[PDB]
Design a protein around this ligand. Structure first.
Ligand SMILES: [O]C(=O)[C][C][C][C]OC1=[C][C]=C(C2345B678B9%10%11B6%12%13B96%14B%109%15B%1172B932B437B%1285B%1363C%14%1527C2=[C][C]=C(C([O])(C(F)(F)F)C(F)(F)F)[C]=[C]2)[C]=[C]1
Lengths: 10, 239
């Protein structure tokens, strides 16, 4: 449920 | 007694901070502009927090051992610590003179009434100021300041952590680095009880965290206010 977090975490 | 691994850890965290903290405040002209003359400052300060989250994430990625966590745990830890790390890293621009965060210019110099103009009350702002004062008086070495940020992020007791075992062992290497640093490179009397004082500041931040999320949920339950937030702030802080 966290698309932008996971993208930013590489 | 500062081992080679420990000096390594300090080198990486110093560099990770300098790569994610720009003391020129160049990017501030990209935010929605500040208005003072109605939650006037909420667009500009929500933009600042959303930017700051991206910087905190880039710092967290460089903390040694963090990438050996699962993405679920990494998400847990960043969701819980984001506002605390932002408050802690804001101490660098805080000036005890006029009790304001002086990020370069007067437009980008924020006092307690600016924070009020984003929807927050002195229930939060009063402990927040005394937090920034007490940290300012600890006179921390930059080495200690970046170790503290790392220890904040990698906490085993955050709600929903899965591998508390691995999280605890990662934090332990950082706490032992900090304790050994204080002992070896921070002369008395400023070293007196310094580790305990720094851990007290993390406790101050847990309380500040709880109050932030109460006033955030109140704030963002009004859709007029949600509209002024950013998509990243919403995903991290909720709804
Ligand atoms: O790389 C670089 O350039 C280095 C950059 C240097 C970094 O400078 C700074 C970054 C952040 C801060 C702040 B200091 B305290 B005081 B309160 B907290 B820190 B953050 B702003 B101000 B207000 C803040 C704040 C505002 C808004 C909300 C919100 O609750 C809301 F907006 F009010 F709703 C929300 F939603 F979370 F944003 C929560 C908290 C000051 C300086």
């Amino acid at each position: 449920n966290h698309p932008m977090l996971m993208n930013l975490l590489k | 007694k500062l081992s080679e691994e420990q000096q390594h850890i300090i080198a990486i965290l110093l560099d990770a901070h300098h790569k994610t903290y720009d003391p020129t405040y160049a990017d501030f002209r990209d935010f929605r502009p500040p208005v003072r003359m109605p939650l006037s400052m909420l667009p500009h300060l929500a933009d600042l927090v959303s930017y700051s989250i991206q910087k905190v994430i880039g710092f967290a990625k460089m903390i040694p051992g963090f990438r050996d966590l699962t993405s679920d745990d990494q998400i847990v830890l960043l969701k819980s610590s984001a506002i605390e790390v932002i408050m802690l890293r804001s101490n660098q621009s805080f000036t005890m003179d006029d009790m304001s965060w002086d990020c370069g210019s007067q437009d980008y110099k924020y006092d307690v009434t600016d924070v009020s103009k984003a929807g927050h009350t002195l229930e939060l702002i009063e402990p927040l100021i005394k937090f920034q004062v007490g940290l300012k008086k600890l006179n921390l070495h930059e080495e200690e300041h970046v170790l503290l940020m790392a220890i904040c992020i990698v906490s085993p007791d955050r709600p929903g952590v899965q591998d508390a075992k691995l999280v605890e062992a990662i934090q332990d290497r950082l706490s032992n680095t900090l304790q050994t640093y204080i002992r070896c490179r921070h002369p008395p009397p400023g070293s007196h009880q310094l580790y305990a004082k720094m851990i007290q500041k993390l406790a101050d931040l847990r309380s500040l965290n709880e109050e932030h999320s109460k006033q955030y949920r109140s704030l963002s339950f009004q859709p007029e206010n949600s509209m002024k937030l950013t998509p990243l702030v919403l995903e991290v802080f909720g709804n």
